[PDB]
Each structure stands twice: as C-alpha cells, then as structure tokens.
C-alpha cells in the first residue's frame, strides 16, 4: 500500500566517489577500477576557454585525487569529449558491475549529490523533453552522477556540469556528451520550451488506482487521433502505439484499458481537479515510468 517518489539504493555509488581538484578549483569524481572520471572543466578557472590547449599545459601531479584519508595518484590522463578519464595507480576496491548508458528523453534515474567527495543525500530525477533535469544542485555538486540498478549492475547515465538561468541543470553521459544543445562554458544558453511526458502521467494514474483513487476513471473510451490532438493543446506529448503496449501489463492488472485512462486525463486537462488530490498531489506528475510503478506496486528488489 502507498506510493512514494522513491529512489534506488544509492549504496553502491558512495564507495566509488572521489574528490578532484586542480588549483582553486575542486569538484567531485567517480572512481572505477583504476580510473577517475569528472567534468573536464575543473582544469579551468569561463567564457570561451579551450580545454584542449589548457590540458596540454597540465600534468599528472596537477590532479590531487582525493579518497578521504587516501590520496590517489594520477599516473596518466587523457580526455573523452567532455570528461576526464584520470588513471590512478590503485584499483577501486568498492567497484561493482556497471554500464555507461545513455537514456531517451523521458526515462528516469536517481542522483547522488556529492560535496568535496562526499554523498549529501540521494534523489530520483527524470530526463525532461528538453534534455534538462530539475534537481537540487549547489555551488559544488559537479561530478555527481546519475545511475540506475538492475539488481547487481549500475547504469551510470548522467554527470552534473552546469545550471541554466531558470534553475535547471544539465550534464553529460559518462562518456562526455551532454543531453542537449549545451556547451560547458559561460555563454548565453536558453534551456528550451519543455512539454509534459504523457506516457508517465498515465502510468502514475494507474499507480493511483492500485491504491484506491478512482474519481478520475469513467466509462468513455477514446481514440488516439483525438487524444493526441487534445494532448498537444495542453502542451502534452502525443501518445504512440509503442507507449501503449508497455502500459498493457499495467492495463490488464487494473481491468481498465490504456485508452480508457487516456480520456479520463482529457477530462482532467479540461476541467481540472477542483480542490482534490490524486496521491497527495494537486498536480499531475509526469515523472513516473511504468517500470517504476511496477517496481513499487510489486516491489522488485536489488542486492
Ligand atoms: C560545477 O561544479 C557547477 C555545478 C552547478 C552549480 C549549481 N548548479 C550546478 O549544477 N557548475 C559550474 O561551475 C558551471 C561551469 C561552466 C563551465 C558551465 C560555466 N557554471 C554554471 O553552471 C553557472 C551557474 C555559472 N552558469 C553557467 O554555466 O552559465 C550559463 C549562462 C547562460 C547565459 C548567460 C550567462 C550564463
């Protein structure tokens, strides 16, 4: 019973994190086997810099890799796109199974904020339809990573870099390429007009039933052709036959069918909610995927 904005067990992530500095400049980094990884802009001190040049005047003693009461020894370095693959003499003892993934705009990851090489708390986030994210990131959180867990793998899939004038962040995949049209320098950058992740407002709605909220369900069915045409006007993102089939597994369990919940949302977008709350939100939350709800509304575990 119940439903929360949970987040994965950030446990395996804490044992890989290392602080990294190169002057009056210190961020966070991620230690895997014998490499440390971090946003290549720790080497700077930001308008139109040129790290390629900056980095050819850098060394291996210029990088003080910090492992708490352990100093790690950059025996080598290089650069992949916008990440700094620092090689250190020692092999990370707390390294689990892992994969560098990239995620389609709409999915979800959890984040471990990290300060001076130290976890500060974990949260769950989602890749917005503009290739940005909404999180708590302060002056100091760079090098913090996003991750997902299928039991005993950690799918490293984001690394904080920068914040956009509206309050939103934007980082790289763990291979040095952002999500979006951004450059890790101090130039004029408008994030972009964002829409709603409709495939996730209806899975959340299903989670609302699973736990006894039915004031939005009805008897109407509807077609896509009209859903997608009513989705667009309230900025929502049209629905695919691809995104319906996933919900199917969750559609069966609830005796409803995916396009029956669709028209219920249409009557929510047109009328509102008029002073109620669906699952503790007087909003609609587009930040829950179907594999998230299956995961809480059954409890698939990880060890
Ligand atoms: C990295 O340690 C640090 C993390 C961020 C602090 C708060 N939110 C974060 O995620 N970010 C930076 O130091 C970052 C470095 C560059 C290379 C991106 C400049 N700087 C920023 O994110 C900052 C907040 C200074 N803004 C920025 O990059 O400029 C964007 C901009 C757009 C238009 C006009 C002026 C500035």
From Swiss-Prot:
It catalyses: TSAVLQ-|-SGFRK-NH2 and SGVTFQ-|-GKFKK the two peptides corresponding to the two self-cleavage sites of the SARS 3C-like proteinase are the two most reactive peptide substrates. The enzyme exhibits a strong preference for substrates containing Gln at P1 position and Leu at P2 position. It is found in: Host cytoplasm; Host Golgi apparatus; Host nucleus. This is 3C-like proteinase nsp5. Residues 1-303 form the Peptidase C30 domain. There is a cross-link at residues 5, 87 (Glycyl lysine isopeptide (Lys-Gly) (interchain with G-Cter in ubiquitin)). It comes from the Viruses. Inhibited by pyridone-containing alpha-ketoamides compounds 13a and 13b. In turn, alpha-ketoamide 13b (tert-butyl (1-((S)-1-(((S)-4-(benzylamino)-3,4-dioxo-1-((S)-2-oxopyrrolidin-3-yl)butan-2-yl)amino)-3-cyclopropyl-1-oxopropan-2-yl)-2-oxo-1,2-dihydropyridin-3-yl)carbamate) inhibits SARS-CoV-2 replication in human lung cells. Inhibited ex vivo by michael acceptor inhibitor N3. Inhibited ex vivo by compound 11a and 11b. Changing residue 202 to V: In strain: Zeta/P.2. It comes from Severe acute respiratory syndrome coronavirus 2 (2019-nCoV). Changing residue 142 to A: Complete loss of 3C-like proteinase nsp5 cleavage. The active site is at residues 41, 142. The lineage of its organism: Viruses, Riboviria, Orthornavirae, Pisuviricota, Pisoniviricetes. 3CL-PRO exists as monomer and homodimer. Only the homodimer shows catalytic activity. Interacts with host FBXO22; this interaction promotes the proteasomal degradation of nsp5.
